[model samples]
Target: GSSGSSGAGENPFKCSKCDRVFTQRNYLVQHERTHARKSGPSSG
Candidate 1:
C-alpha cells in the first residue's frame, strides 16, 4: 500500500540544460530562462 498524500518522492522536474533538479515545475522554467538569457544571441 502507498500513501497518496505523501511528499517523500523524488524531484520530477529535471533541468535538461544543466542537469539540475527542481521541486516545482515553475522553478525549472525560471531557471532555464536564466540560462537562456546568459547564452542568448542578443545581450544588453
Candidate 2:
C-alpha cells in the first residue's frame, strides 16, 4: 500500500508575463484579479 499526502500536491500555475510559478491556483486567480482591478475595466 502507498501512503496518502494531506494538503496541496504541487504548483500548477505559471504567470504568462513574468513566468512566476504559484503553489496554489487560487493565489494565481487572486493575483490576476488584483491586476485587473488596478488596470480598471478599460485596460483589461
Candidate 3:
C-alpha cells in the first residue's frame, strides 16, 4: 500500500475573501479564477 504525505511545511499565499491557503502560487491563481468566475463580471 502507498500513503500520501501532506504537502510542504507551509502555504505561501492566503486568500483574503475565503481564508483558504495554498502552497504553490499557481494554485492560488487558479483558485482566484474560480472565485472570479463565481463572483466577477460574468457571474449570474
Candidate 4:
C-alpha cells in the first residue's frame, strides 16, 4: 500500500501588516520589519 498522504497548511505565523504567512516566527518577524522599513520613506 501507500504511506501517509499530504498534510494541511501549517504556516500559522502571519504578518501584522500583510496577509503573508511564514513557516518560522523569526522569519515572520523579520518580514514584518522589512515591510515597516519599506513602507516608510528614506529617513537616512
lDDT of 4 by residue, 1-44 (tens): 88896765667798877678888999988887787445356443
Residue 17, model 2: lDDT of 45
Clashing pairs in 3: none
**What is the lDDT of every predicted structure here?**
0.78, 0.63, 0.72, 0.76
TM-score, cand. 2 vs. native? 0.42
Query: Can you write out model 2's per-residue Cα lDDT over 1-44, one digit (the tens) per residue?
Result: 97888755445697654456688787787776655433446542
Q: After superposition, how far is residue 32 of candidate 1 from its true place, in Å?
A: 0.6
lDDT (Cα, tens digit) per residue for candidate 1, span 1-44: 86668655668899877778889989999998888535547543
lDDT of 3 at 41: 62
TM-score, one value per model: 0.54, 0.42, 0.50, 0.54
In model 3, state the lDDT of residue 7. 65
Expressed as tens digits, the lDDT of each residue in 1-44 for candidate 3 is 87899765666698755778898788888887787435446522
Off by over 4 Å in 1: 1-9, 37-44
What total of clashing residue pairs does each candidate reach? Answer: 0, 0, 0, 0
